[PDB]
Chains A and B, each alone.
With several copies, the nearest count.
Chain A
Amino acid sequence: DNEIAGQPQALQKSGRPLKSIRARLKGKEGRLRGNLMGKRVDFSARTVITG
């Protein structure tokens, strides 16, 4: 937990939180709702529609 509400910092490069494990899990911007719920996929395509 990079920031367990204590004032640690966890600065790795340029004083910036150290990508923890709990960060990926519940991002967002990661798994949970991006790698487990709504996954891109293949064998698909899209384009403009016409009548």
Chain B
Amino acid sequence: TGRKLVAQVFLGPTYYQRLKHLVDDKIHARARGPVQILTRQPVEGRSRD
């Protein structure tokens, strides 16, 4: 709108750190994927998947 905000903002620079472990590395989805040979249950994280 262009309306002033009723309240006053605390605006002021600072440095934030870009942390590691991003998202596109942490998403996970299964659905009839590979399975162990001995137990015949689903594999663990990673692989594919």
Contact = CB atoms under 8 A, between A and B. Distances in A.
Contacts of B1: none
B28 A47 contact: yes
Interface string A1-31: 0000000000000000000000000000001
Contacts of B28: 45-47
Interface of B: 23, 26-33, 39, 41-44
Interface residues of A, number: 12
A42 B31 contact: yes
Nearest to B39: A35
Contacts of B41: 35, 39-40
Contact of B33 (A35, A39, A42): A42
A41 interface: yes
Given A35-B39, A35-B41, A42 B26 contact: no
B30 A47 contact: no
